[model samples]
Target chain A: PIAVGMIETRGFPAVVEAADAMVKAARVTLVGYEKIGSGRVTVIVRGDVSEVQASVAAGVDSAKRVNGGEVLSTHIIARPHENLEYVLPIRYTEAVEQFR
Target chain B: PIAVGMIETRGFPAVVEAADAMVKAARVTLVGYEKIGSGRVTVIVRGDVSEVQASVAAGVDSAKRVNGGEVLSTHIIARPHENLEYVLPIRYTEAVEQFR
Candidate 1:
C-alpha cells in the first residue's frame, strides 16, 4: 500500500523463532532481529509493500499461537531502525539508486 | 560532556514508574516513553554524559527495587530514539536533561 518499510516484533527470542516460522510460512523472507535485553526480541521483516505490512500482522499472530508469550505489538515503519549496523538485513543489498 | 543520549526500560508499567522516581531523585528529568505493546514500556532519559550513563543503570536498578522485574539490560547511547516525535523530553530545556 505504501513504500519502503520495515516491521518489528517485541517479545522473547523463542517468540522470534515462532515469528520466523510465520514469515517463512507466508513465503516471505525473514529479515531477523536483535536481543533488546534478554527476554524480548525485535525482528524486522522486509519485502514488497503489501506483503511486508501483512506479514507484520501475520507474524505476530502466528508467533503467539505456537509460542506462549505476548505479541506486544508490531511496528510498520517507513524505514528500518536507525541502529542498523547490528542488523544489515543480511547479505541483501539495498538499491540506493532505486530510491534515488 | 559528550552529547545527547537515551535509556530504555522494557518491562511492566510499575517498573517504568519506579525508574522514573529514581531518575527524579538523582536530579534528572524524565524525558518520557512509547508503549511498545500492552505490557511493556520504553523510557528515554538524558543528562550530563556520565550522569546519563549512570542513570541508565540507576534507573534500571531503581525500577527493579520499587517494582520486581528484570532490568534485562541498560545501554548508554549517543543519541535518542530515532522516533522522537512521541517522547520529546518535555517543557524543561536541556542542559543535561534527566529522567524517572
Candidate 2:
C-alpha cells in the first residue's frame, strides 16, 4: 500500500529544504505543499512505507539544519483512508503522475 | 488596519479548540483553516492588530489544554502584504463576512 508522509515546519525555507531532502533521501514523490498563516508550511510525499519513513526522517533532519528553521511535526500514514483524499491535499495529481 | 492571526496545531481537535477560543476571546472573524498532512492544521483569523494578538494568545492557551493537543506555532501579521491574499488562504471570504 502506498504510504503518505509529511513534515511541518515553522518557516518557508525550512519546508523547502525538507521537501528537497525528502525526495532525495528515498524513492518518494514530492507531491505538494501547504502554507498556512504564521509562517507555517508543510510538505507531503508518497511512497512505500519504508521509503516514506526514510524520507520523513531525512526531511526533519535537513529542515532543522536550515537557518532559523523549526520542525513542528512529522508523521507517516501507511494506507490512509481513501476518504481523506477528497478532503485533503495528500493525493497525487495529474501533474505529478509522471513521477509516480 | 486588518491584521491576520494564526495558530497551528498538531491535531484536528486542537485546531478546532483554538479557533473556538480565538473568536470567543476577541473581536475576530474565523476566516478559514488549512490542513496539511501529518495531522498539522492551522486556523486563521482576521481583525484589528490588538484583537488579533489577543485572539492568538487565547488560541495558543486553549489549544494546549486539549487532550493530546500540541500548539506548534502562532503568529500575528499586522497589515500583511496584499500580494499574499492572492496566493495564500488568509483572506476573509463572503461566507465569513457576517462575522466581521
Candidate 3:
C-alpha cells in the first residue's frame, strides 16, 4: 500500500468527488483518508495493489482532461499503505514516556 | 508529549494562525504538524509539561473569542507525543512491502 498518486484541483468538491469515484469504480474501497493540509483533500484506497495502481492511473488520466484543472499526479507521496490507521499506536507507549 | 489540547474551528486560516501564535508565544518551537481534515488545522506542541499545557490553554482561549468562533477543543487525538517529525524513519524504504 502506497500513495502512488495525488490529484489537486481548484474545485475542492469536484476533485474530492473524482477521487472517490476513482477508487469505487476500480472496486478499491476506501480504507481511510489522512489529512494532508488545509483545503487539501487526501483520500486513501486499499485493494489489490494492481487495482490501486490502475485507479490512480485512471484518475490521473481522466483528471487531466479538464481545462484549468490543477490535478496533481504523483507516483510517490511517501504515504504509509498499511491497515494501521494511526501511527500513534504500536510504538506509542515508548514515545509517550519521552514526552513525560 | 500528549496532544494536550486541540482547537477545531470554521475559519481555517485563522485557526492555523492562532495555533502558530499560541506555540510561539510560549517559546515553544514548531516540532511538526499533522493535518486534521479539510478546512481543519492541528498544531502539536511539545515541551515541559507546563509549557505544553499553557500553549493548549491559550489556543483554546484565543480560538474561542472569535466573533464567529467555532473551535472544538480536545485533549487527545491519539498521536504519539514524541520528538519526532515523521513517524516512520526517513530510512523506511517500504511503507508496506507486503503488498509488493
Candidate 4:
C-alpha cells in the first residue's frame, strides 16, 4: 500500500504550504522537503496510492493559492523502488512518526 | 574568500562523484547535496572564488566520465546572500568541520 507523491514549486514558502495541505487533505505523511537551487523546492508525501493521489492534488491547488506561488511539477509513483527509500530523502522522520 | 559552486547531475551516483571530484580538485568543502526528483541531484561546494571555479570545472569533467553520468547544470556564485547560508543546507557541518 506504499506510494509516493511529490510536488515542486518555485518558492520555499509555497512548497511548505503544499506540504501542510497534503497532510491535512489525506492519510499521508509528509516525508521530506528538498531544494534544488535557484529557489526550486519540493515536498514529498507517502501513503496508500489513492490517498497519495488525493493529497498531491490538494497540495498543488493549495500551492497555487499562495502569493507568488508557481508549481513546477507534480507526480505520484504507485510503487517506487525500495532502493529509493534508502538513497533519497523520501522517508518519514521520527518527528512525524506520531501521525503514522 | 566565500564563494559557492554547484553541479547538478541526472543521477545520484554521478552527483556523488562530482562532490568527490570538487573537493579533491581544489581547496573547497563539500557542503551539501540536494535532490529534486526524477533522479536530479546536485552537489555544492564552497571556497575562494578561484578555487570554487576550479572545483566546479573539475567536478563537471569528472561527473561526465562516470558511467551513465549526465550533468544537467553547473554554476558558481561569488557572493551569495547571507540569509541563504542559514536557510539552505550549504553550510559547513560538524562532521566536515575538520576539513574546513
Order of candidates by lDDT, top first?
A: 2, 4, 1, 3
Per-residue lDDT tens digits of candidate 1, residues B15-57?
A: 5664566476454555555344545555555556666656665
lDDT measured at residue B64 in model 3 versus the true structure, 0 to 100: 71
lDDT tens digits by residue: candidate 2, A1-100: 8899999887543565677678778888877788776556888888999999998998898776654569998899999998998899888876667667
Q: Which ten residues in a row have the lowest lDDT in candidate 3 chain A?
A: A88-97
lDDT of 3 at A30: 41
**Candidate achieving the largest lDDT:** 2
Instruction: Judge the docking of candidate 3 as incorrect, acceptable, medium or high.
Output: incorrect
Per-residue CA lDDT of model 3 for A1-100, tens digit only, reads: 3343344443232243335455544644443333345445444444555666776766666545433234543442335445443552212233323322
Ranking by DockQ: 3, 4, 2, 1
- Show where candidate 3 strays beyond 4 Å: A1-100, B1-5, B76-85, B88-100
A1-100, model 4: which lDDT tens digit per residue?
5888778787888999999999999999997887656566778888999999899999999999999998876767676533344335677899988878
Q: What is the C-alpha lDDT profile of model 3 across B1-100, one tens digit per residue?
A: 4333334455665576657666755744444344445544445444455665677678767777766665533332223212222321111124323211
Q: Of the candidates numbered 2 and 3, which has the greater lDDT value?
A: 2
Which one wins on TM-score? 2
Candidate 2 residue runs with Cα over 4 Å from true position: A1-100
- lDDT at residue B65 of model 2 (Cα atoms): 93
Per-prediction DockQ comes to 0.02, 0.03, 0.08, 0.06
Q: How does each model score on TM-score? A: 0.40, 0.55, 0.37, 0.54
- In candidate 4, position A46 carries an lDDT of 86
**Candidate 1 recovers what fraction of true contacts?**
0.00
Clash statistics: count for each candidate: 6, 0, 1, 0
Error at B66, model 4, angstroms: 25
Clashing pairs in 1: B19-B100, B20-B100, B29-B98, B29-B99, B30-B99, B46-B97
